[PDB]
Amino acid sequence: LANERLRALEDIEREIGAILQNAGTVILELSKEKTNERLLDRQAAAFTASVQHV
Amino acid sequence: REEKQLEASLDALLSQVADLKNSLGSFICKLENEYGRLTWPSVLDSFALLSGQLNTLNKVLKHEKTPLFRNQVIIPLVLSPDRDEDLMRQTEGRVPVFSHEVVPDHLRTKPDPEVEEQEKQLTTDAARIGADAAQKQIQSLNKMCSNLLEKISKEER
Amino acid sequence: KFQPSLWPWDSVRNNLRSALTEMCVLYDVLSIVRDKKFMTLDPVSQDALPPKQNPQTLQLISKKKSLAGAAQILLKGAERLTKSVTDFNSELLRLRQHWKLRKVGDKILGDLSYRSAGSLFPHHGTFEVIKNPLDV
Amino acid sequence: RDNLLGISWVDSSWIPILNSGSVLDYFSERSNPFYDRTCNNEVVKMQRLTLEHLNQMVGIEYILLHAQEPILFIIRKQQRQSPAQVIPLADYYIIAGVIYQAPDLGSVINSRVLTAVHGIQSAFDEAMSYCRYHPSKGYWWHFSSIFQRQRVDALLLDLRQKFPPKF
Amino acid sequence: SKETLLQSYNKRLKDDIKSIMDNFTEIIKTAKIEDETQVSRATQGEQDNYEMHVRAANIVRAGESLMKLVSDLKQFLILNDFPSVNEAIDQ
């Protein structure tokens, strides 16, 4: 009972994480210099992994 | 030949502007007569469909396979101060007496002074870093943006 | 000065109707351009010199500002979700753990009688569940 | 000089003297920002012979197009390369003795759609401010019958008949 | 019917994921700088700003719809997932 419901709670938190990863990726792209392009790739993979497992 | 292309461009762009006009009118009359029960999804949907469809369609019919619209210049032939019912029937329920005021009202390319002050501020911001950091930022942005679209187009498979 | 009873959402209507006026200006000018009478077209070859490198710098600063606003609305919605999740369906957990419930249509009802327990009493105990966190 | 389209040029003392050639004389008193000082037409006006000095002195000339007698005289500017070789530079139509440069077909549509996107942008950014969300509540803005009434209703109809209303 | 409701839930989920992905990809594509031809820098920039803001709003709306889907699925599970009703009754 707590199992499937806690799965639903986790998917709530991961929808929040998906929106925050979208926002962080365009945050890094809006920078005048964005040196951590590897971190941009990491945030992009994080975003797509979040959407996919949701 | 090119005049037929200009006539096609004028008809197609008048079509797109007519769709945007009907979309704006439907949205404003919906806001008036439908004021109650109006959720934020409803107005986001209307804003998105209106601006997305009609701005993108105007841009794509403005920037492919078209004659240069700087080349055509607008000039009037006559100015006759009389109530022309054929003009009233042409321009749709608008455009009173064809006189000394309407063409000096319409051929106006000075914008509002707010966006003119905005343009002054853009030229002020243009006085900053240019031609090395500018080219560097353009190239890096295009590279990383192509990289992300490549990532998403790969993962979509 | 009075309008069909719209005292909120008036300024949005002002901006939209100003857009409607200039769009009627566009329809007007291209229609009177489209007929040969009252307005005409002449093909002129003229050229302009851009005084500064406008597409590079203008596209740069405008796209950084646009991406700034987009990230602002996105991250504002994100933190709204964070504060938004940090109660109805927990009470539905407890209520279903003690009582017998079901859903018909959009309505959520429950049985109060002992007809599950064996009574043939000709009276149904249908109580409604009403979100108000929860009420019956 | 920055935007020639947004300027207006008049002379009020030369309004009641307005005839066909006097439109181009009106155009050539002095100090019009539109009309050039280095035009050939000034050199035409310097010595003599305004009939053929438009043509023998090759360059930018200012050719009147269409004549309406009270207010409308269309002055067009062209470059010549030879006699009977006419190439358009710019257009200048007069209205009540007021010259306006004729705008291009592109720039008018661009200026109007600029005002379009600006107005809808302000409207949308206002509308985005009002909407407030909660998952439990949803969206919002920042601004019975006991079923024995069939018998009571039939009794009401019998009351309507047995006692009618009287205005 | 129950089948119809489950199908509708599947449709909503597919639509929400598709919308988030499409809006993000379209924002990234507009983010490309291109050379201008007959677009008048200022107008092109305002149109692009409006598009980005509207797409971000659409992404947030899709996230809210996904929250609504999760809530509806939770309600369905609490009301008619027969095993857990049986373990609750027995306990």
Side-chain angles (χ1 to χ4, degrees):
Chain A
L1 301 90
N3 38 15
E4 302 266 339
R5 191 213 176 195
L6 267 167
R7 289 166 192 174
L9 291 172
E10 286 148 0
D11 305 354
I12 288 182
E13 291 176 351
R14 296 305 174 160
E15 284 150 347
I16 308 191
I19 294 289
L20 197 142
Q21 276 160 355
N22 282 271
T25 309
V26 293
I27 276 291
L28 189 55
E29 287 181 352
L30 78 94
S31 174
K32 319 290 305 161
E33 166 65 15
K34 30 179 185 195
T35 296
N36 48 5
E37 320 176 11
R38 323 187 183 197
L39 177 139
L40 198 136
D41 264 8
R42 289 185 183 91
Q43 288 221 24
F47 149 78
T48 321
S50 58
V51 164
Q52 279 176 2
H53 80 82
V54 155
Chain B
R1 188 162 196 172
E2 191 183 358
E3 173 61 34
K4 303 291 183 190
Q5 193 172 189
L6 289 149
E7 187 255 335
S9 278
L10 281 177
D11 270 328
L13 288 192
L14 263 183
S15 79
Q16 310 310 120
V17 177
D19 311 335
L20 178 51
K21 179 171 75 172
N22 198 33
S23 288
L24 285 153
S26 52
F27 184 43
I28 297 157
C29 74
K30 196 258 288 179
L31 287 193
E32 291 168 41
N33 286 18
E34 275 76 17
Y35 172 64
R37 51 85 188 169
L38 187 80
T39 77
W40 168 246
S42 299
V43 289
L44 205 163
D45 197 5
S46 58
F47 269 132
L49 85 86
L50 174 135
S51 67
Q53 287 164 0
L54 312 148
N55 273 0
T56 49
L57 275 177
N58 261 331
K59 187 164 77 170
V60 302
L61 280 171
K62 191 180 287 292
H63 82 271
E64 72 92 27
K65 201 255 181 182
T66 184
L68 173 67
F69 282 139
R70 313 187 294 115
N71 275 13
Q72 298 309 114
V73 191
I74 294 179
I75 49 170
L77 307 166
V78 302
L79 195 144
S80 66
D82 63 349
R83 264 291 284 101
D84 200 318
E85 68 284 342
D86 218 27
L87 271 171
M88 269 310 189
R89 195 192 187 189
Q90 187 212 21
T91 74
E92 308 314 337
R94 264 307 173 183
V95 175
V97 183
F98 192 34
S99 281
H100 54 69
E101 203 266 352
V102 53
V103 184
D105 184 286
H106 273 262
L107 286 173
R108 286 196 46 165
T109 41
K110 172 72 60 201
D112 61 83
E114 314 293 353
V115 70
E116 200 41 66
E117 192 49 272
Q118 283 270 353
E119 174 59 40
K120 294 312 285 168
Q121 286 153 341
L122 309 171
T123 59
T124 322
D125 298 333
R128 264 76 186 269
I129 42 174
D132 183 32
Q135 305 292 332
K136 180 63 199 166
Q137 276 176 337
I138 289 161
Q139 289 144 25
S140 54
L141 173 137
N142 191 21
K143 281 161 219 157
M144 294 308 299
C145 169
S146 176
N147 286 319
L148 287 210
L149 269 153
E150 275 147 18
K151 276 188 154 203
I152 300 170
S153 63
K154 175 208 316 193
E155 287 162 342
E156 270 154 357
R157 274 86 56 85
Chain C
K1 328 295 192 63
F2 187 70
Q3 183 208 355
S5 78
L6 259 270
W7 186 248
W9 311 92
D10 43 359
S11 65
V12 57
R13 189 173 144 274
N14 307 148
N15 305 138
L16 282 167
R17 269 181 307 130
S18 85
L20 192 45
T21 63
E22 52 84 24
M23 212 45 74
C24 282
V25 155
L26 264 183
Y27 183 84
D28 191 12
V29 71
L30 295 177
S31 45
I32 198 166
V33 146
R34 213 164 53 84
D35 206 318
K36 193 73 172 174
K37 58 194 174 209
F38 312 117
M39 213 66 69
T40 38
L41 285 308
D42 188 76
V44 183
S45 191
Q46 77 273 2
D47 265 6
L49 198 166
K52 195 177 183 295
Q53 274 178 205
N54 48 299
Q56 311 91 326
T57 68
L58 286 177
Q59 274 165 348
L60 266 165
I61 59 191
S62 46
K63 282 291 174 293
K64 305 325 289 195
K65 279 299 293 157
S66 180
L67 208 52
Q72 178 54 49
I73 169 173
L74 260 187
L75 201 38
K76 149 203 161 290
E79 58 89 11
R80 188 176 70 251
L81 264 294
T82 72
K83 66 106 172 183
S84 290
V85 306
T86 41
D87 199 56
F88 183 79
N89 297 132
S90 88
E91 276 199 318
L92 261 187
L93 265 156
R94 283 187 314 150
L95 182 66
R96 198 267 304 156
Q97 268 167 35
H98 299 304
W99 296 91
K100 197 222 287 188
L101 282 84
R102 59 196 166 93
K103 183 172 176 68
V104 291
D106 46 1
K107 271 309 288 158
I108 164 168
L109 309 190
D111 195 296
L112 210 54
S113 57
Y114 285 100
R115 207 183 283 110
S116 80
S119 55
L120 308 180
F121 191 55
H123 182 275
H124 57 279
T126 57
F127 62 98
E128 287 82 13
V129 194
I130 289 308
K131 31 175 170 180
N132 193 36
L134 190 144
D135 208 322
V136 285
Chain D
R1 197 263 169 205
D2 42 356
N3 185 1
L4 58 94
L5 290 88
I7 327 175
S8 297
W9 183 77
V10 296
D11 190 316
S12 298
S13 45
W14 285 55
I15 297 187
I17 51 164
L18 271 192
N19 198 239
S20 201
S22 176
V23 180
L24 201 44
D25 301 348
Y26 189 104
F27 210 51
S28 302
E29 323 150 350
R30 197 73 279 169
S31 178
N32 181 25
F34 295 83
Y35 171 66
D36 305 323
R37 268 72 63 192
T38 41
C39 58
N40 311 265
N41 282 255
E42 269 322 290
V43 198
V44 179
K45 289 146 209 150
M46 292 302 90
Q47 51 274 39
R48 293 182 183 174
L49 296 174
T50 179
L51 311 182
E52 198 262 354
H53 283 187
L54 313 97
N55 305 115
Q56 72 161 97
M57 306 273 106
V58 63
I60 294 187
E61 282 85 12
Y62 291 71
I63 290 94
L64 273 51
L65 283 184
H66 172 65
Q68 169 208 288
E69 191 43 49
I71 74 163
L72 186 47
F73 269 83
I74 292 95
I75 301 194
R76 181 176 174 186
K77 171 166 57 207
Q78 281 101 328
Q79 59 218 312
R80 298 234 170 207
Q81 292 165 310
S82 48
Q85 191 72 305
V86 196
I87 301 94
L89 284 156
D91 299 334
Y92 307 93
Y93 63 101
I94 77 163
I95 291 298
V98 182
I99 54 163
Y100 288 145
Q101 194 271 320
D104 299 329
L105 178 70
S107 306
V108 52
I109 309 187
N110 300 339
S111 46
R112 299 313 172 192
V113 76
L114 190 149
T115 44
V117 177
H118 160 244
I120 308 183
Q121 174 83 32
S122 61
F124 165 70
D125 207 356
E126 269 179 355
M128 198 267 280
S129 64
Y130 310 148
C131 46
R132 310 305 303 232
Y133 170 81
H134 197 273
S136 318
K137 260 192 173 180
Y139 299 90
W140 65 96
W141 296 120
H142 209 309
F143 310 120
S144 87
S145 178
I146 86 188
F147 317 116
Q148 184 188 18
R149 321 294 212 190
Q150 49 273 9
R151 320 189 69 180
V152 188
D153 274 328
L155 178 50
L156 290 178
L157 297 174
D158 303 1
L159 187 61
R160 294 179 188 181
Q161 171 146 355
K162 201 196 296 177
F163 291 85
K166 291 178 182 69
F167 297 93
Chain E
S1 61
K2 287 311 176 181
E3 202 40 40
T4 59
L5 287 170
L6 293 157
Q7 294 159 13
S8 81
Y9 289 137
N10 253 325
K11 313 171 186 178
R12 292 191 216 166
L13 156 66
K14 291 184 178 181
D15 304 11
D16 294 355
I17 272 56
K18 284 166 190 179
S19 175
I20 290 185
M21 290 311 305
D22 295 353
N23 299 315
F24 201 47
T25 56
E26 216 170 344
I27 291 174
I28 296 176
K29 174 193 315 175
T30 190
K32 285 184 180 179
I33 174 176
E34 301 93 2
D35 296 357
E36 58 156 347
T37 164
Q38 322 193 8
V39 207
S40 61
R41 270 306 309 111
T43 73
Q44 184 172 14
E46 35 213 294
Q47 173 183 338
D48 296 339
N49 178 229
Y50 194 118
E51 287 164 351
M52 284 199 191
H53 284 213
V54 97
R55 295 200 213 89
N58 279 292
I59 298 181
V60 161
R61 198 269 217 67
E64 289 159 333
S65 61
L66 266 179
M67 289 289 308
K68 294 155 202 154
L69 255 164
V70 164
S71 79
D72 292 6
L73 288 183
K74 268 188 156 198
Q75 174 165 332
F76 193 99
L77 188 76
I78 196 46
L79 256 39
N80 49 315
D81 164 47
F82 277 26
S84 46
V85 192
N86 302 337
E87 288 108 20
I89 280 175
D90 173 75
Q91 194 271 330

